[PDB]
A paper describes a structure:
Oligomers of the β-amyloid peptide (Aβ) contribute to neurodegeneration in Alzheimer’s disease and are promising targets for therapies against Alzheimer’s disease. 2AT is composed of β-hairpin peptides that mimic an Aβ17–36 β-hairpin, while KLT is composed of β-hairpin peptides that mimic an Aβ16–36 β-hairpin.
To stabilize KLM into a triangular trimer and thus create KLT, we mutated A30 and L34 to cysteine to create KLMCC and then oxidized KLMCC in aqueous DMSO to introduce disulfide cross-links.
Author numbering:
A (entry chain E), B (entry chain F), C (entry chain B), D (entry chain F), E (entry chain E), F (entry chain D), ...: 1 to 16
Write the structure that this text describes.
């Protein structure tokens, strides 16, 4: 898997 | 734009 | 305190 | 949105 | 001074 | 190239 | 509060 | 769980 | 050992 | 190689 | 000592 | 110059 940083703008990293 | 580290506790970054 | 990086996934730092 | 780490060398992050 | 992250969107930290 | 935070759980950034 | 990377050169993040 | 930075030296963050 | 982020506040990562 | 963080100011990581 | 980021590629920070 | 991560232990990045 990959650690992905999204941000709806606040940012958060999530493991996918 | 800037990246703010709102940590209001936890820390999240967002721009302005 | 400490700065825990909870991985509940998603990583968030929080002061504990 | 995502944060990409274009490192094309140096590293810079940008969203999509 | 402060280390400030701006991003014209690619991000870069700079000491101000 | 792009730099992805790999995962499989430890995380490493690598070049691609 | 906000978390700023202080500087004066070393950098530290602190709560405000 | 939380992210642990092991020191094997070298530093690897792992989800524990 | 582990790298632990103390909130001595200001964030400082130290070994233990 | 190594990952130098040049502070020419502004911080950029580059593979050297 | 110093924390040096090796590009062993993948980025790994190690002590020296 | 470049950012050096001193290990005094604890880790402080300083502009050198």
């Amino acid at each position: 898997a990959k650690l992905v940083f999204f941000a709806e703008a606040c940012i958060i990293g999530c493991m996918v």
